[PDB]
Amino acid sequence: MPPYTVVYFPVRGRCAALRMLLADQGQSWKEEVVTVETWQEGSLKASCLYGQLPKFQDGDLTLYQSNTILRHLGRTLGLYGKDQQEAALVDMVNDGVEDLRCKYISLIYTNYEAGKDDYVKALPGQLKPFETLLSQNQGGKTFIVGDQISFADYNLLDLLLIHEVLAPGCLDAFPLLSAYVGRLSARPKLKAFLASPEYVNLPINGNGKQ
Amino acid sequence: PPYTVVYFPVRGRCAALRMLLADQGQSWKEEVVTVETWQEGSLKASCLYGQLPKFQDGDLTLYQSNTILRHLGRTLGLYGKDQQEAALVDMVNDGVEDLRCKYISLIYTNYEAGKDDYVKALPGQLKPFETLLSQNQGGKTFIVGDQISFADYNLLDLLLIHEVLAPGCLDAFPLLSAYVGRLSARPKLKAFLASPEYVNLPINGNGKQ
Ligand SMILES: N[C@@H](CCC(=O)N[C@@H](CSN=O)C(=O)NCC(=O)[O-])C(=O)[O-]
Ligand SMILES: N[C@@H](CCC(=O)N[C@@H](CSN=O)C(=O)NCC(=O)[O-])C(=O)[O-]
Ligand SMILES: [Ca+2]
């Protein structure tokens, strides 16, 4: 059996980035799907540390919190910068990605109809920091931090992909981020994963909105 | 080092990192940002995500409170003994961050009408931390492993501000209760928590708590 197990609802959501990471790094993992019906049962939810998913297993290590899973995999697979200084920059990027993801999730699940217009208008200002970071790192020709891929790249990549769906052409204003999405998405293992049913046949979110 | 904390005159998202620096015997400077300065626009525009705190470690400039905590945890050896513990430390910190976000939402956007439901839901929000303690050396040491981590400081702050919001919220949790008393008694931290540097700052920026 695989050493890694992802326990989550049948959506990309907060597991999209970690899955891209696993696939691109040639890692093996199992998908344990939890249906909304099974979740309503209460048993599993009550057993979850913070009463939520994703839940992740690495051998007998049981983790919760999507960013905890990303950092754990980043640590173990060498995707956390070349030194302590870079590790901090990677965290700074991931925390920024998380802040915007939280806003994105809030829109999708609690106020889509009445908040989309404002969200899209504010989007450029929210994406600009990442374009700025790319511009300050090798002209944005490599990764978000340093000269090697990090877990933050996978999280940012997902953030960009879902926003292109939410607001088509949103990266027209950000040449480096646009090229970055195309470049990372072309990586052999990641490219195959992104085109596979395992990824394509899952909705981005669980409420039919995107 | 040297360390510089750039923030508004409140405890807020710098409380935990300050407790960490003080408890670890580190020296740092406080750059207090005024309303005029922030409204002026220049400083804000220069911040990566347009927000504070901003942190200086020598020639390294950081933003994001949890990035600062993890950086100090990494460089000062407050991140568990190995990868397994580091993951648990992250799990705790992310849990603390989630509740802090809910707390922030309450304080700044729905205090009057939302306090009732928030306090009613609080016990269920704190229980996970009691459970974590119960599974680590009977809760007699730290939140993860046998050494203090950056998550301990963040959790400690979370618990302190909730005791203000809802007095007695830890009475049902013996491990958390003893944990707060134990951590708060650490010499350097005790002195810091009793100093006006800490005491004379409001918890939040809108006078609510
Ligand atoms: N800070 C946590 C959040 C986990 C979370 O919000 N999980 C949701 C599904 S993903 N939603 O955007 C969840 O488990 N919802 C069910 C419930 O809350 O009962 C994380 O894993 O990043
Ligand atoms: N995710 C960030 C949030 C930083 C933040 O919210 N900063 C606020 C002050 S603390 N508020 O609860 C801030 O800089 N507000 C001024 C503004 O946003 O113009 C962090 O540092 O954790
Ligand atoms: Ca240590």
From Swiss-Prot, chain A:
One of its GO terms (molecular function) is glutathione peroxidase activity. Residues 83-204 form the GST C-terminal domain. The modification Phosphotyrosine is found at residues 4, 199. Pfam families: GST_C_3 (PF14497), GST_N (PF02798). Keywords: Acetylation, Cytoplasm, Lipid metabolism, Mitochondrion, Nucleus, Phosphoprotein, Transferase. It is found in: Cytoplasm; Mitochondrion; Nucleus. Residues 2-81 form the GST N-terminal domain. The modification N6-succinyllysine is found at residues 103, 116. GO terms for cellular component: cytoplasm; cytosol; extracellular exosome; extracellular region; extracellular space; ficolin-1-rich granule lumen; mitochondrion; nucleus. Its EC number is 2.5.1.18. Changing residue 105 to V: In allele GSTP1*B and allele GSTP1*C. The modification Phosphothreonine is found at residue 62. The keyword Mitochondrion applies. It catalyses: RX + glutathione = an S-substituted glutathione + a halide anion + H(+); prostaglandin J2 + glutathione = prostaglandin J2-S-(R)-glutathione; prostaglandin J2 + glutathione = prostaglandin J2-S-(S)-glutathione; prostaglandin A2 + glutathione = prostaglandin A2-S-(S)-glutathione. Its main location: cytoplasm. Conjugation of reduced glutathione to a wide number of exogenous and endogenous hydrophobic electrophiles. Involved in the formation of glutathione conjugates of both prostaglandin A2 (PGA2) and prostaglandin J2 (PGJ2). Participates in the formation of novel hepoxilin regioisomers. Negatively regulates CDK5 activity via p25/p35 translocation to prevent neurodegeneration. Belongs to the GST superfamily. Pi family. This is Glutathione S-transferase P. The lineage of its organism: Eukaryota, Metazoa, Chordata, Craniata, Vertebrata.
